[PDB]
RNA sequence: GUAAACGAUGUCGACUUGGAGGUUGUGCCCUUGAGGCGUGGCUUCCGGAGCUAACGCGUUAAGUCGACCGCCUGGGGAGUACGGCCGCAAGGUUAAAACUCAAAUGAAUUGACGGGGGCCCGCACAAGCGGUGGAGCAUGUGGUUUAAUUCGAUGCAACGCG
């Protein structure tokens, strides 16, 4: 951080689908190294999402991700010893990472049944713009618009 | 200061004209100096200027740069 | 009313505010706006963005006169000095000549004290 | 106002609302859920359904399409 | 009638290598063209010998000499008290002692420090994940108690430690 840099950590793509976004989703939502316990959750969620949406891969994940991925966000960039937040332009690589974290947090909330169902409902809501995950995006947009004075 | 400058199309080009009086004079006349702090400030400013020739004097080294 | 054709803009900026006034060429004020009154109370009304907002807020609400040419006159050096002529030109105005008038004494009255 | 439990995270299940009042159709589209903690104000002119929507969310005006939903522990 | 009224350097005169400039006079000359060649007055910066405790001064000496004047004799007490003179007054000028200490003081050197500066680093901040601080129990430590609650470690670097 202070001096050095990193190329990246290469990730093995998804087993069932020819993609890596879903593998990173599994990595984000697993816990205690229980990848074999997160895999069933994610695949069950994408099973019960396709039947309600009408498509298997795009409408399952991407359309619920592009309604929750952020565009700008606030960071502390004081100059003269103050504390006001300065909005910044988020980068394309971090957009998906932020979106998936927000979706997984919204799905960890909303406690009704198994996580394989909580995530499915939260993702349908994300695809329609109806969840807490998209509410977080709207709130951060409000903050950035309000602090748009500093640039 | 007053400019028409019809020849450009929405190009300010008033930098040259604003860099005549506004930047320095108004910032100077905002507060009273002392009548004796101006002389000290001028003396220090013009004593630092002659250090430019002393810096110029330092070129004559190989320095392996 | 009276459909004034060519007008005068006053951009009175300062280290705490930026007041923008649209008037006729004789000096009868048509409409004014200010960064502080645009909903920016505090340190946020010193930024050039607030001046940009005030310029548009003054260009609006004066379409009752339908002005096409504006002679801008800039006073009181501050953050909203160059960021307001573009905000006016982003409102449908002909910025003909940008006069800069600014009070300069020839060593007149004594200024205030120096702060600490 | 006192302190409730405020447990249910899904406040209601909203889908294909089609509120009509029988003779006509009043509203058919809908917006984001109440997502506990949200504060929403309904603008709009008169005779536009601002009260039909309130009664539909309250549960005293059954939608013609059906399944307007409401969480288990909402007071 | 007092100032850090300060180049903290009394006035006058004589002598003793150079360099880069500023401003103000003058003669000659290829002003033959925004130029050269000499000579005075004032002035800024750097520097040789020499001088100096060092810092530095260095032809405008703090160098080498002469004339005249003013002032100093450890730090406090103290530029104070009393007295005289001056002042409308505030005060100014001249000016002690008793007592007390063995030190005050200048310049420079090595460190340390700065809410002084410059350049780099560290899971230091930032970006994240998971925790302690809340409840039950285990263990240690202080406290209080007791016939004894054996002794030691007790900021970081003692407290699941000997
Ligand atoms: N009980 C009813 N039966 C039939 N039509 C009704 C009934 N109540 C309301 N409507 C109709 O539904 C429409 C909206 O009525 P509603 O009371 O919801 O209005 P609103 O937009 O909330 O405005 P307001 O401020 O007047 O209450 C109107 O056209 C009205 O005539
Ligand atoms: Mg003031
Ligand atoms: Mg005195
Ligand atoms: Mg004196
Ligand atoms: Mg003097
Ligand atoms: Mg003296
Ligand atoms: Mg004499
Ligand atoms: Mg010298
Ligand atoms: Mg006295
Ligand atoms: Mg006396
Ligand atoms: Mg002294
Ligand atoms: Mg505990
Ligand atoms: Mg013990
Ligand atoms: Mg241990
Ligand atoms: Na109503």
């Amino acid at each position: 951080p202070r001096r050095r840099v990193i190329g990246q950590r290469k990730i093995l793509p998804d087993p069932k689908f020819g993609s890596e976004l879903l593998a990173k989703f599994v990595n984000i939502l697993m816990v205690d190294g229980k990848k074999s316990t997160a895999e069933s959750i994610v695949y069950s969620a994408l099973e019960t999402l396709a039947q309600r949406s009408g498509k298997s891969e795009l409408e399952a994940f991407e359309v619920a991700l592009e309604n929750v991925r952020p565009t700008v966000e606030v960071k502390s960039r004081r100059v003269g010893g103050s504390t006001y937040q300065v909005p910044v332009e988020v980068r394309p690589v971090r957009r998906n990472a932020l979106a998936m974290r927000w979706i997984v947090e919204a799905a960890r909330k909303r406690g009704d049944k198994s996580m394989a169902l909580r995530l499915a409902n939260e993702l349908s809501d994300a695809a329609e713009n109806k969840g807490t995950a998209v509410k977080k995006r709207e709130d951060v947009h409000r903050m950035a618009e309000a602090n748009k004075a500093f640039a | 200061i007053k400019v028409r400058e019809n020849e450009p199309f929405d190009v300010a080009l008033r930098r040259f004209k604003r860099s005549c009086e506004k930047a320095g004079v108004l910032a100077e006349v905002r507060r009273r100096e002392f009548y004796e702090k101006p002389t000290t400030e001028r003396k220090r400013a013009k004593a630092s200027a002659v250090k430019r020739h002393a810096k110029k004097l330092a070129r004559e080294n190989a320095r392996r740069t | 009313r009276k459909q004034v054709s060519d007008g005068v803009a006053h951009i009175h900026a300062s280290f705490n505010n930026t007041i923008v006034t649209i008037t006729d060429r004789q000096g009868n004020a048509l409409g004014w706006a200010t960064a502080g009154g645009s909903g920016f109370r505090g340190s946020r009304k010193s930024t050039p963005f607030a001046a940009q907002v005030a310029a548009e807020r003054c260009a609006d609400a004066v379409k009752e006169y339908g002005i096409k040419n504006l002679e801008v006159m800039v006073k009181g050096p501050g953050p909203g000095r160059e960021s307001t002529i573009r905000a006016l030109n982003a409102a449908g105005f002909r910025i003909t000549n940008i006069t800069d008038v600014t009070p300069i004494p020839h060593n007149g009255c004594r200024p205030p004290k120096k702060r600490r | 106002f006192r302190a409730p439990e405020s447990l249910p995270n899904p406040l209601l299940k909203m889908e294909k609302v089609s509120a009509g009042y029988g003779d006509r159709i009043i509203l058919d589209s809908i917006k984001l859920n109440l997502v506990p903690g949200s504060r929403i104000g309904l603008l709009g002119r008169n005779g536009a359904g601002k009260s039909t929507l309130i009664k539909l969310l309250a549960g005293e005006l059954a939608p013609v399409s059906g399944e307007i939903g409401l969480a288990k522990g909402i007071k």
Side-chain angles (χ1 to χ4, degrees), chain C residues 36-116:
Chain C
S38 162
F40 277 104
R41 270 284 328 199
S43 161
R44 280 172 189 161
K45 77 177 157 192
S46 318
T47 89
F49 181 76
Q52 159 180 326
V53 176
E56 158 89 323
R57 282 286 304 266
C58 192
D60 196 301
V62 310
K63 292 320 289 161
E64 197 188 356
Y65 302 80
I67 314 175
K68 319 278 138 78
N69 313 299
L70 267 202
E71 189 173 344
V72 165
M73 291 184 324
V74 156
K75 199 181 205 160
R81 193 183 189 69
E82 74 278 46
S83 314
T84 187
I85 71 172
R86 278 171 293 176
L88 292 163
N89 245 339
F93 271 112
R94 262 220 58 90
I95 307 291
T96 84
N97 44 342
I98 323 161
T99 320
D100 174 71
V101 77
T102 315
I104 282 285
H106 303 344
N107 217 78
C109 319
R110 182 191 189 113
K113 259 164 32 202
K114 192 209 148 289
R115 309 165 58 211
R116 280 167 268 181

Side-chain angles (χ1 to χ4, degrees), chain A residues 1-4 31 94 98 101 108:
Chain A
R2 198 166 252 298
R3 181 73 76 87
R4 261 69 208 178
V31 53
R94 200 174 193 251
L98 251 170
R101 296 210 310 269
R108 254 163 186 141

